[PDB]
Copies of this chain bind each other. A is one copy, B any other.
Amino acid sequence: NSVAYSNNSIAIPTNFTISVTTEILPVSMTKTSVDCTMYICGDSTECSNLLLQYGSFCTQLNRALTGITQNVLYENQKLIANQFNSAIGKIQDSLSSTASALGKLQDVVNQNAQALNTLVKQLSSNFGAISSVLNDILSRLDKVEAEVQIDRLITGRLQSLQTYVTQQLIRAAEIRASANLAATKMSECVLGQSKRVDFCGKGYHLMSFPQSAPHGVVFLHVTYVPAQEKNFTTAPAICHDGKAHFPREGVFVSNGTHWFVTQRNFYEPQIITTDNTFVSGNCDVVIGIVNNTVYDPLQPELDSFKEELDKYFKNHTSPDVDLGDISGINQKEIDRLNEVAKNLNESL
């Protein structure tokens, strides 16, 4: 017998004061369209120009927000002439061979001088080519290492603008429920008179007059409130000898000695009769349970970042460049010939 038969002091209106309410409801929302450049980047031109490559995403967000003795002296004469004539013929061999040698040395040394001027013109091409191609690799890699940091901050400002768009759609879906509240609260109280307590102004409803506002409706409700009220002890129902008895359109207001079915909204007692009450059987309480679970969503739970990275990420490190190490590739006779050019006159 838990609560259905407990008696507790309940305020019941003793008397009334006449009153009026001004109740304001928003029924529409002005279309807060957003320029996506000025929101995310603002004045800053390098990120602005990057925004064009994010596509027409801005428009897409605005679809949402815009909706919603003479012999031996002579034989010595033969001898010395035969020694000389044979010597000079050996001088011509000695000298012709030296000319044929020194003329092959002067050939090959000038062919080497040609080869080194060929090498310098080709290597001037290589250090000039590498100058231009490697300056471009440096100049463009500096651009790409800048842009990847500005894209980072654009992408975190995208989420700030997506929180803006979500909170601006959330509010517009509350506004469209407040326009349904303005529909029922117009109907039941401008076309009718409500029997509900505090719907259509504080207290109990008499009459109403709607007036517009720029995005709203405002109600003038004329109502009566309890100027004074008294706590009577009560029960919702009473179980006499195993039968439960309970009101019809009232409560059991409790006098010191008797039960009366007062109207809930006023102290005006009337006697228990089979026309003021309903009746039951066996004196039992049915117990009901209601649990209004507003929806608790499947929230997007994720692995640790290491697992969702390592699934596809490649930690490729290019090797330390090594190339060819070219540091590993490592007068006396003219004095005499000048001396004997003089000292041969000592044998003239």
Bound state CA distance, A32 and B291, in angstroms?
22
Task: Report whether A102 and B102 are in contact in the complex, using a CB–CB cutoff of 8 Å.
Answer: yes
Tell me the number of copies of this protein.
3
- Residue numbers in B under 8 Å from A304 (CB-CB): 42-44
Which of A57, A64, A70, A280 has most chain B Cβ within 10 Å? A57
Residue of B102, B120, B195, B324 touching A125 (CB-CB under 8 A):
B324
Task: Report whether A166 and B164 are in contact in the complex, using a CB–CB cutoff of 8 Å.
Answer: no
Task: Report whether B17 and A284 are in contact in the complex, using a CB–CB cutoff of 8 Å.
Answer: yes
0/1 string, A115-147, CB within 8 A of B gives 1: 110111011111101110111111111101111
User: Is A153 part of the binding interface, using a Cβ–Cβ cutoff of 8 Å?
Assistant: yes
Q: Which of A274-332 touch B at CB < 8 Å? A: 278-281, 284-292, 294-300, 302, 304-306, 308-309, 311-318, 320-327, 329-331
User: Is A273 part of the binding interface, using a Cβ–Cβ cutoff of 8 Å?
Assistant: no
Task: Report whether B94 and A297 are in contact in the complex, using a CB–CB cutoff of 8 Å.
Answer: no
0/1 string, A204-227, CB within 8 A of B gives 1: 001101000000000010101101
- Residue numbers in B under 8 Å from A272 (CB-CB): none
Task: Report whether B157 and A148 are in contact in the complex, using a CB–CB cutoff of 8 Å.
Answer: no
Given A134-B133, A316-B145 in contact, is the A300-B164 Cβ separation under 8 Å?
yes
- Residue numbers in B under 8 Å from A8 (CB-CB): 209
Task: Report whether A197 and B187 are in contact in the complex, using a CB–CB cutoff of 8 Å.
Answer: yes
Bound state CA distance, A202 and B321, in angstroms?
82
- Residue numbers in B under 8 Å from A133 (CB-CB): 134, 138, 321
Given A10-B207, A127-B323, A150-B313 in contact, is the A60-B160 Cβ separation under 8 Å?
yes
Residue of B54, B139, B297 touching A171 (CB-CB under 8 A):
B297
Bound state CA distance, A69 and B203, in angstroms?
178
Q: Which of A23-74 touch B at CB < 8 Å? A: 23-26, 40-44, 47, 50, 52-57, 60-61, 63-64, 66-70, 73-74
Task: Report whether A88 and B148 are in contact in the complex, using a CB–CB cutoff of 8 Å.
Answer: no
- Residue numbers in B under 8 Å from A81 (CB-CB): 76, 80
Bound state CA distance, A99 and B207, in angstroms?
137
User: Is A257 part of the binding interface, using a Cβ–Cβ cutoff of 8 Å?
Assistant: no
- Chain B residue nearest to A309 (CB atoms) is B153
Bound state CA distance, A118 and B140, in angstroms?
34
Task: Report whether B305 and A42 are in contact in the complex, using a CB–CB cutoff of 8 Å.
Answer: yes
Given A178-B294, A294-B174 in contact, is the A333-B102 Cβ separation under 8 Å?
yes
Please give the distance in Å from A2's CB to the nearest CB on chain B: 6
- Residue numbers in B under 8 Å from A331 (CB-CB): 103, 106
Q: Which of A1-34 touch B at CB < 8 Å? A: 2-4, 8, 10, 15-26
Bound state CA distance, A278 and B101, in angstroms?
144
23 pairs of residues in contact across A and B, judged by CB atoms under 8 Å: A4-B18, A16-B279, A23-B290, A47-B309, A53-B153, A57-B159, A77-B80, A80-B81, A80-B84, A99-B338, A106-B334, A116-B119, A123-B326, A144-B148, A153-B309, A166-B169, A169-B170, A170-B297, A173-B295, A192-B198, A206-B236, A207-B236, A222-B237
